[PDB]
Design a protein around this ligand. Structure first.
Ligand SMILES: CCCCCCCCCCCCCCCCCC(=O)OC[C@H](COP(=O)([O-])OCC(O)COP(=O)([O-])OC[C@@H](COC(=O)CCCCCCCCCCCCCCCCC)OC(=O)CCCCCCCCCCCCCCCCC)OC(=O)CCCCCCCCCCCCCCCCC
Ligand SMILES: CCCCCCCCCCCCCCCCCC(=O)OC[C@H](COP(=O)([O-])OCC(O)COP(=O)([O-])OC[C@@H](COC(=O)CCCCCCCCCCCCCCCCC)OC(=O)CCCCCCCCCCCCCCCCC)OC(=O)CCCCCCCCCCCCCCCCC
Ligand SMILES: CCCCCCCCCCCCCCCCCC(=O)OC[C@H](COP(=O)([O-])OCC(O)COP(=O)([O-])OC[C@@H](COC(=O)CCCCCCCCCCCCCCCCC)OC(=O)CCCCCCCCCCCCCCCCC)OC(=O)CCCCCCCCCCCCCCCCC
Ligand SMILES: CCCCCCCCCCCCCCCCCC(=O)OC[C@H](COP(=O)([O-])OCC[N+](C)(C)C)OC(=O)CCCCCCCCCCCCCCCCC
Ligand SMILES: CCCCCCCCCCCCO[C@@H]1O[C@H](CO)[C@@H](O[C@H]2O[C@H](CO)[C@@H](O)[C@H](O)[C@H]2O)[C@H](O)[C@H]1O
Ligand SMILES: CCCCCCCCCCCCO[C@@H]1O[C@H](CO)[C@@H](O[C@H]2O[C@H](CO)[C@@H](O)[C@H](O)[C@H]2O)[C@H](O)[C@H]1O
Ligand SMILES: CCCCCCCCCCCCO[C@@H]1O[C@H](CO)[C@@H](O[C@H]2O[C@H](CO)[C@@H](O)[C@H](O)[C@H]2O)[C@H](O)[C@H]1O
Ligand SMILES: CCCCCCCCCCCCO[C@@H]1O[C@H](CO)[C@@H](O[C@H]2O[C@H](CO)[C@@H](O)[C@H](O)[C@H]2O)[C@H](O)[C@H]1O
Ligand SMILES: CCCCCCCCCCCCO[C@@H]1O[C@H](CO)[C@@H](O[C@H]2O[C@H](CO)[C@@H](O)[C@H](O)[C@H]2O)[C@H](O)[C@H]1O
Ligand SMILES: CCCCCCCCCCCCO[C@@H]1O[C@H](CO)[C@@H](O[C@H]2O[C@H](CO)[C@@H](O)[C@H](O)[C@H]2O)[C@H](O)[C@H]1O
Lengths: 237, 77, 81, 189, 125, 80, 558, 85
């Protein structure tokens, strides 16, 4: 019944819905954060502060393991190995393909760790879904048309896309097992920063700050000194 | 979430009575007219509630030959 | 026309005209005409040109069609009562 | 059918809680232009008279119209000791021998009951009492509810009320046929 | 190349039209023997027997109508040879009128000749 | 500024249904003579104009009606 | 059965909003029209000039049912245009019974088959045609003035809606607007004529009017002048609806503006019902006795229309460069032959009238299918001509100019000969079917004294043959301005097609180029059945012509 | 408590409806010959009142005499119109 959290169920906070995979998202964000910190020198207190905190949270996240994780990961290792070209960002883009009505995965590497980012076609009512959700680019150009117009109309996509039912050279990526609802609660009682989904919001904020903290080089000496009498107010004596 | 009539007919009818009441009970009432035509009239003839004869809307002329009256003649005037 | 018919005994249809034309058709006409942008000078044509053709077609249609009407419609010095 | 008619009759008069469309004009007038229903009592007498008229017609159709529930039928059923001496004894548990004056009251009362002025008066006081009760229910409705948005009133009419009405348009003549109760359409009554 | 549920929806509609056209064709096949537009030797005998069996039972030949003699005549004018217009418009007779296009003297004649046959047999024994 | 199409639909759906109910008022003042045969025809006429009403109900022609989980799912595989 | 079909289809399309669900509703509209053909086919076991049904407001005739079934089949052939995708992919590896029945092919079909094309997305298009068909088969069987009026409006209003259904084309909405505004004025004429009939005769029944005309036709206070004056106004409205000159300026403009799929239906169906209805009206308004009544015969308007339609239709078509405007004018010259056969009321003219209408409805249909198929064929072709670049609604009417057909013999030789065999039938060259139609109309006219019109007809037939040959010279006498698409055959450009089996296991994979994309079978087979009927009629003429001889034997019988 | 002041206008409306029905029943009574007025009158009722006028001179007049008075045969009114028909 309530063994697992429904994904996208309201959390109590408006606009924040239950994460489909909270543990792996948090792991992905932490490791990605640790990788961008190597653009920053070692003697900056910013990097040490972010490193220590990030590693501290990374340790507690890894302290909990979903049931069946060891079994699942062994199959997923092989499934990647024998079908690597299916999940390659250099082959199928950062998105896992263009057939949004079909399953899309991609292998991504951060900081010595391997992740699969699988984007799943949205579950819609059959009573409203046209052509199983295949995106409508419009009608094909018909009639007397030029070579250039046919190209900009997408004709070369005939020899690239695939029928969504065409699954012979491909293998289905199976998702990671989730934490239980009680396990998620225990994760929350360790990290100590509220709801798991709200921790991901903070965690993906630390990821974005590194890009600004490197571009501005905050560890460099003070730019503009206070000229004399700049922060002087009305103090007596 | 919301059911499908042709997968679960009884389960759809409960949802529609609860979630689309004005629409659901419109089709219910409309069906009761067809039912009431089929049911009450035979039961009425079972209990002996005979339908009333039609009222006359024209002069009621009796059939057959004229009766050859005798009476009320010009001499009586 | 609705009153003309009510006045001569045709109440239901005379009331039907009221309910249907003035009630609903001319209302739909008013909606569309009060929402479409209309520049009242682009709909104006030189009407003075078509006076001769108005003169010609008025005589020809009137002279022919009137013979087709029945006696009861054109029933209206000894006057028949 | 009566409830739908009364609700339809409030919405038809543009009265609150169905007046948000004409209500929003005063909120977007701006700093350059203004309304036109200003010094005119016409569109106010046209409005109040259409509310009163929608109350009289609502009473004509569903309440009695001018029909007073006559108590003179009840007294006939209860009273059984008719007396020619004017006593007018009643065969009831709270009854006694009344002393109604034949010369003074009964002769006068009987005549006034059959007067053309008195009977017409009660027929119009009945229709008036019934119209006034409905005038109360219009005023009570305006003081009880907030306003409905135009799309929501449109949904009420087109996806709730009219479907129910067309369902009842099927059912009603079907029952009148099933119980031999189609009335005669000749001039009777 | 339709989506997931589209063919199931269409199968339902094609199925209703099949029950519709299927019943109209079955009814129209039987009723043309009544009209004389199909070989009807079997049904002439079944008609002669039943209609004569009704006469001798005192029954109205075509049954009793709750409708007025005038509404019975409107009904009859609407349904006479109407299965011939089935491909455009569906109509069925559900009224007990006595206007059926046939001279009913034969049913009465045959009832009379059948009654006179049975009476002699009873008198013989 | 473009005008909204729903104004047109209000007048049209009224215009047709108002013509349709008008065609039924003669039935209500002729019921006794019409009887069963008239009822059946009127039921057929009521049924046809009802089906066209469920079409605008089914399509929101009056345009009165019609007024989230993330697809991105990450999996952890471990070290290389 | 047409009415049970509209209500059932209406209920289904009322609760769905899915546009992918249109191809299947058009397939059921073809199955629906097949049950109607099974019902009218079985209603043909009697002889009668007519049987009044439903209170006398309708009639049934042997000529009425034959035309009901002809209407249903012409409708089933146009419906195929919206029930099957325009192109298909075929490989000899998937061509046997075991394959087409138990195996399956999987590939990316969307851009090959134009799955989300416009004509594949309207959901109410199968329903609107079925309401037009209903008005047509009611007009055929109308026995009363009101019934005529209510039927003609049911058919006319649905034609306007079909002409406006491509809501996102400036051309289509313009054409529907021209059609409604000129069509509404035509309806006033039809309504004026019927009103003046009832107001002078006291009757709305055609048979009563026929008897009032029958008693008058004898060689004092009440001359029946109204019948011929009323029917002349009445026929003016029906002349406009069939686009006979002088009331013809609307058809070239409307037929060119609306999409070609649509102009197949609109430019065929209304003539079949209007011309069958007029024939019965001409037979019973005849003046057997030469009296003053025949001097004002309403049939003179048809004789003047036919004469004017023969000239206008063949002269104005000489300078057309747009193919659909050309075909619109060609139809006006064909109604000048239909109208002459109707105007001469004889046993031979009616048999020639019945043949001309059926065969012309069948052949102009082939001219519309060939045009639509050629448009779909150029998907694997490209062009650099500067004039084709500026055409409008290039998707709703792919072929618009006669110059876009230059060198089609080089692209598709037999499709070009199908368009040749069909156009030579319009000219009236033997042994083609359209010869045997003009032969009968000319023989009927000559036998009964219409020598002057016959000489006019054969003169304009030479003139009308000029613009037909310009189409033939353009397809065969020149080299195409359309070249194969270079990318479709690039050696590196191939689409992978998977052969599965019943339990969805790969049987084979195949590599396919644009050379493996063809026309769909419903279009190819329909074209070949009609081209063969036009070319082989001289060997298969007994049943078709005999049906007409029997039909006119009853209408004229007794 | 009962706010009879707010109730005063409603009583006014009831008194006005009473006066219309009161005063309209009496004007019709006198108009109809001090007898109650006719209501749902069809063609039959109107012609019956016309023959009442023929016998008495009043559309509401009533007489039980078995024989019609001399002249009754010629007083049958045939209406004449100029236009409608
Ligand atoms: C354009 C498109 C058109 C499409 C439709 C085509 C319709 C074709 C023609 C049908 C209509 C005309 C016939 C009915 C008129 C009439 O006077 O009936 C005679 C009939 C009795 O006349 P009678 O002179 O005694 O004749 C002998 C009877 O057969 C002896 O009568 P009985 O004693 O057997 O009476 C009992 C009988 C009463 O029914 C009948 O007898 C006839 C009605 C059967 C119609 C069946 C459906 C149509 C197929 O009831 C039943 O058996 C159950 C059915 C009741 C109605 C159920 C709902 C039907 C529509 C469902 C959707 O009158 C009635 O009983 C009155 C009720 C009729 C109601 C009909 C409602 C139809 C509405 C259809 C809407 C769509
Ligand atoms: C008078 C007209 C009354 C119309 C309202 C009837 C209720 C209604 O809207 O039903 C649809 C309503 C919506 O259900 P849904 O499952 O959400 O509709 C989508 C499905 O694809 C269901 O799509 P579907 O085409 O399979 O079903 C729609 C259609 C069933 O249509 C068919 O399957 C064949 C068409 C029957 C035509 C009958 C003409 C008489 O349902 C009806 O209208 C049945 C009326 C009897 O419930 C039904 O399906 C009730 C069927 C009984
Ligand atoms: C006066 C006239 C007198 C006429 C005398 C007879 C003259 C010869 C007529 C021969 C008619 C053959 C009809 C069957 C046919 O097309 O056979 C080849 C047909 C398609 O083979 P294909 O042309 O190589 O196309 C390859 C793919 O199927 C790819 O094909 P697709 O996906 O492009 O379309 C396949 C199919 C689409 O239609 C169907 O699926 C048929 C459904 C039937 C129900 O096409 C057709 O069947 C079109 C038939 C049009 C007939 C009416 C024309 C007017 O063979 C099959 O696999 C069909 C199954 C066998 C026939 C079953 C139905 C027979 C009755 C059909 C009545 C309509
Ligand atoms: C050249 C252009 C050709 C264009 C394509 C169309 C070609 C055919 C043109 C019309 C020819 C006549 C067709 C009439 C309808 C079909 C009748 C037929 O052939 O068989 C009748 C038969 C009648 O069958 P039945 O079972 O009713 O017959 C009973 C009587 N006995 C048993 C004695 C024969 O087929 C049908 O069922 C009719 C409907 C068939 C489905 C629709 C077919 C449309 C074509
Ligand atoms: C026999 C049983 C009785 C017949 C049926 C009675 C009528 C019940 C209500 C009819 C419609 O019933 C239901 O209404 C809701 C309206 O939001 C719709 O239900 C669905 O609509 C669309 C699908 O098209 C979805 O996007 C939406 O999430 C869902 O609510 C459908 O239209 C229908 O499934
Ligand atoms: C179905 C049978 C109906 C029988 C009774 C029919 C009665 C019809 C009477 C119509 C008289 C005018 O109708 C009435 O006009 C007035 C003035 O335009 C409108 O009143 C309007 O102006 C007033 C201000 O002056 C506003 O307070 C009101 O909100 C606004 O709508 C009413 O909304 C309308 O109901
Ligand atoms: C190019 C020309 C296009 C013309 C379009 C119209 C063509 C019409 C062709 C069909 C003509 C009638 O075809 C007829 O169908 C009916 C169907 O029951 C059958 O006819 C049969 O009917 C009944 C049985 O139902 C029998 O009692 C009868 O004796 C027999 O003739 C035969 O099959 C055929 O005689
Ligand atoms: C005898 C009286 C019968 C009265 C009517 C009986 C019920 C028939 C009407 C409802 C039939 C079902 O029709 C259903 O209507 C609903 C409500 O608009 C539609 O609703 C759906 O589409 C519309 C339009 O996009 C959306 O605004 C809506 O949110 C969505 O749920 C469904 O697309 C349609 O399937
Ligand atoms: C490419 C074209 C190929 C040929 C296309 C046309 C072929 C079909 C033509 C059939 C019509 C003529 O053929 C004939 O006509 C008559 C009158 O209509 C009808 O004849 C019908 O009525 C009679 C009279 O009661 C019945 O007894 C007979 O059983 C029945 O068939 C049939 O329809 C058909 O038998
Ligand atoms: C000079 C240019 C060429 C002109 C002639 C072309 C071929 C003409 C053929 C012979 O001319 C032809 O004569 C025959 C018989 O006399 C006429 O046929 C005749 O049939 C009926 C028979 O009752 C006659 O009453 C009537 O006078 C006429 O119609 C043709 O209408 C006419 O066309």
């Amino acid at each position: 019944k309530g063994k697992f959290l429904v994904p996208g169920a309201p959390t109590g906070l408006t606009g924040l819905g239950t994460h489909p995979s909270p543990r792996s998202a948090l792991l992905y964000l932490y490791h990605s954060t640790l990788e961008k910190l190597k653009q920053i020198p070692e003697h900056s207190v910013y990097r040490q502060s972010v490193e220590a905190v990030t590693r501290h949270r990374l340790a507690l996240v890894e302290s909990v393991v979903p049931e069946g994780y060891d079994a699942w990961v062994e199959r997923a290792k092989k499934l990647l190995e024998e079908h690597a070209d299916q999940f390659d960002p250099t082959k199928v883009g950062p998105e896992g393909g263009e057939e949004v009505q079909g399953a899309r995965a991609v292998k991504v590497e951060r900081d010595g760790r391997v992740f699969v980012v699988s984007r799943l076609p949205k579950e819609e009512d059959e009573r409203v879904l046209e052509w199983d959700g295949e995106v409508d680019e419009g009608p094909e150009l018909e009639g007397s048309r030029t070579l250039e117009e046919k190209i900009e109309g997408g004709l070369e996509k005939i020899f690239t896309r695939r029928d969504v039912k065409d699954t012979v050279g491909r293998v289905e990526w199976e998702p990671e097992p989730q934490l239980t609802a009680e396990q998620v609660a225990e994760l929350e009682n360790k990290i100590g920063a509220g709801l798991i989904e709200e921790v991901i919001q903070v965690a993906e904020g630390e990821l974005k700050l590194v890009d600004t903290m490197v571009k501005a080089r905050v560890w460099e000496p003070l730019e503009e000194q206070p000229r004399p009498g700049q922060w002087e107010y009305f103090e007596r004596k | 979430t919301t059911p499908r009539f042709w997968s679960t007919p009884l389960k759809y009818c409960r949802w529609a009575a609860r979630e689309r009441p004005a629409l659901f009970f419109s089709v219910v009432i409309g069906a009761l007219g067809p039912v009431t035509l089929a049911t009450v009239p035979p039961l009425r003839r079972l209990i002996g509630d005979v339908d009333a004869a039609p009222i006359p809307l024209t002069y009621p002329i009796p059939p057959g030959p004229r009766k050859q009256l005798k009476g009320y003649d010009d001499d009586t005037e | 026309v609705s009153f003309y018919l009510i006045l001569i005994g045709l109440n239901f249809v005379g009331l039907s005209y009221l309910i249907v034309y003035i009630g609903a058709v001319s209302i739909l006409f008013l909606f569309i005409l009060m929402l479409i942008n209309i520049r009242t000078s682009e709909l104006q044509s030189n009407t003075s040109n078509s006076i001769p053709l108005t003169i010609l077609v008025g005589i020809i249609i009137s002279s022919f069609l009137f013979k087709m009407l029945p006696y009861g419609v054109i029933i209206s010095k000894n006057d028949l009562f | 059918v009566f409830i739908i008619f009364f609700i339809g009759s409030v919405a038809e008069t543009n009265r609150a809680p169905f007046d948000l469309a004409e209500a929003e004009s005063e909120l977007v007038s701006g700093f350059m232009t203004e309304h036109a229903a200003v010094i005119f009592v016409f569109f106010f007498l046209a409005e109040y008279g259409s509310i009163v008229l929608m109350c009289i017609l609502t009473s004509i159709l569903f309440l009695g119209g001018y029909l007073l529930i006559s108590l003179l039928d009840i007294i006939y059923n209860n009273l059984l000791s008719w007396i020619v001496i004017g006593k007018y004894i009643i065969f009831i548990f709270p009854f006694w021998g009344p002393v109604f004056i034949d010369l003074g009251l009964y002769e006068i009362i009987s005549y006034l009951y059959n007067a053309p002025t008195v009977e017409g008066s009660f027929y119009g006081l009945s229709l008036g009492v019934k119209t006034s009760i409905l005038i109360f229910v219009f005023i009570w409705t305006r003081a009880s509810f907030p306003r409905i948005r135009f799309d929501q009133l449109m949904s009420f009419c087109w996806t709730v009320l009219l479907p129910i009405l067309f369902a009842l348009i099927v059912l009603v003549p079907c029952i009148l046929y099933s119980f031999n109760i189609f009335p005669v359409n000749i001039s009777l009554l | 190349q339709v989506g997931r549920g589209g063919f199931a929806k269409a199968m339902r509609l094609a199925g209703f039209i099949g029950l519709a056209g299927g019943f109209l064709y079955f009814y129209q096949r039987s009723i043309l023997r009544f009209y004389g537009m199909s070989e009807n030797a079997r049904e002439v005998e079944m008609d002669m027997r039943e209609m004569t069996d009704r006469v001798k039972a005192g029954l109205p030949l075509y049954g009793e109508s709750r409708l007025s003699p005038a509404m019975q005549g409107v009904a009859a004018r609407q349904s006479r040879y109407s299965a011939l217009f089935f491909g455009v418009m569906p109509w069925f007779n559900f009224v007990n009128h006595n206007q059926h296009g046939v001279d009913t003297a034969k049913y009465y004649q045959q009832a009379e000749r059948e009654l006179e046959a049975e009476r002699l047999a009873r008198e013989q024994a | 500024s473009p005008f909204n199409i729903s104004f047109f639909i209000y007048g049209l759906v009224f215009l047709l249904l108002d013509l349709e109910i008008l065609l039924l008022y003669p039935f209500a003042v002729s019921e006794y003579v019409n009887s069963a045969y008239g009822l059946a025809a009127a039921l057929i006429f009521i049924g046809i104009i009802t089906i066209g009403f469920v079409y605008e109900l089914g399509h929101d022609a009056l345009k009165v009606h019609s007024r989230l989980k993330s697809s991105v799912v990450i999996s952890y595989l471990g070290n290389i | 059965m047409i009415m049970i079909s509209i209500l059932s289809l209406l209920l289904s399309t009322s609760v769905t909003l899915r546009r992918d669900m249109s191809i299947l509703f058009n397939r059921i509209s073809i199955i629906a029209l097949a049950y109607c053909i099974l019902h009218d086919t079985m209603s043909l076991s009697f002889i009668s000039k007519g049987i009044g049904l439903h209170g006398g407001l309708l009639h049934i005739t042997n000529l009425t049912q034959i035309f009901h079934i002809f209407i249903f089949i012409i409708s089933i052939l146009i419906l195929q245009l919206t029930s099957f995708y325009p192109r298909k992919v075929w490989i000899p590896e998937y061509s046997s019974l075991k394959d087409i029945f138990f195996n399956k092919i999987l590939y990316y079909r969307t851009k090959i088959i134009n799955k989300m094309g416009e004509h594949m997305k309207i959901i109410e298009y199968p329903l609107i045609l079925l309401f037009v068909i209903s008005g047509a088969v009611f007009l055929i069987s109308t026995n009363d003035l009101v019934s005529i009026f209510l039927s003609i409006e049911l058919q006319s209003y649905g034609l306007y809606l079909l002409s406006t259904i491509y809501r996102n084309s400036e051309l289509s909405t313009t054409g529907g607007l021209i059609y409604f505004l000129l069509g509404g004025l035509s309806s006033c004429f039809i309504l004026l004529g019927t009103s003046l009939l009832y107001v002078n005769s006291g009757t709305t029944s055609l048979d009563g009017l026929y008897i009032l005309n029958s008693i008058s036709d004898v060689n004092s206070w009440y001359k029946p002048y109204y019948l011929n004056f009323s029917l002349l106004i009445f026929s003016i409205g029906f002349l406009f609806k069939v686009s006979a000159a002088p009331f013809h300026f609307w058809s070239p403009d409307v037929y060119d503006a609306i999409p070609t799929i649509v102009t197949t239906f609109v430019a065929i169906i209304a003539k079949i019902s209007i011309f069958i209805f007029l024939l019965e009206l001409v037979y019973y308004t005849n003046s057997n006795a030469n009296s003053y009544l025949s001097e004002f015969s309403w049939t003179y308007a048809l004789l003047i229309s036919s004469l004017l339609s023969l000239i206008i239709g063949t002269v104005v078509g000489l300078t057309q460069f747009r193919i659909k405007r050309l075909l619109a004018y060609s139809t006006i010259s064909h109604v000048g032959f239909i109208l002459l056969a109707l105007s001469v009321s004889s046993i031979e003219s009616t048999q020639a009238f019945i043949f001309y209408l059926i065969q012309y409805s069948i052949s102009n249909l082939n001219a519309f299918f060939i045009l639509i198929t050629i448009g779909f064929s150029l998907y694997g072709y490209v062009t650099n001509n500067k004039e084709y670049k500026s055409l409008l609604d290039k998707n709703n009417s792919p072929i618009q100019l006669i110059s876009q057909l230059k060198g089609y013999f080089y692209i598709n030789p037999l499709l070009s000969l199908s368009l040749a065999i069909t156009i030579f039938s319009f000219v009236g060259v033997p042994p083609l079917v359209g010869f045997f139609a003009k032969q009968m109309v000319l023989s009927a006219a000559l036998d009964n004294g219409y020598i002057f019109l016959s000489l006019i007809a054969i003169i304009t037939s030479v003139i009308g043959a000029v613009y037909y040959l310009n189409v033939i010279k353009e397809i065969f006498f020149y080299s195409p301005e359309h070249e194969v698409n270079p990318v479709l055959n690039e050696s590196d450009s191939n689409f992978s097609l998977r052969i599965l089996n019943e339990k969805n296991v790969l049987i084979r994979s195949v590599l396919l180029k644009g050379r493996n994309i063809f026309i769909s079978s419903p279009f190819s087979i329909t074209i070949s059945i009609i081209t063969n009927v036009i070319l082989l009629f001289i060997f298969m003429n007994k049943e078709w012509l005999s049906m007409g001889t029997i039909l006119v034997q009853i209408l004229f019988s007794a | 408590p009962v706010p009879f002041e707010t109730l005063i206008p409603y009583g006014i409306i009831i008194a006005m409806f009473g006066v219309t029905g009161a005063g309209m029943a009496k004007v019709r009574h006198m108009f109809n010959g001090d007898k109650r007025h006719r209501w749902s009158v069809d063609q039959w009722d109107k012609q019956q009142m016309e023959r009442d006028r023929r016998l008495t001179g009043h559309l509401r007049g009533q007489t039980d005499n078995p024989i019609a008075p001399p002249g009754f045969e010629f007083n049958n009114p045939w209406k004449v119109x100029x236009x409608x028909x």
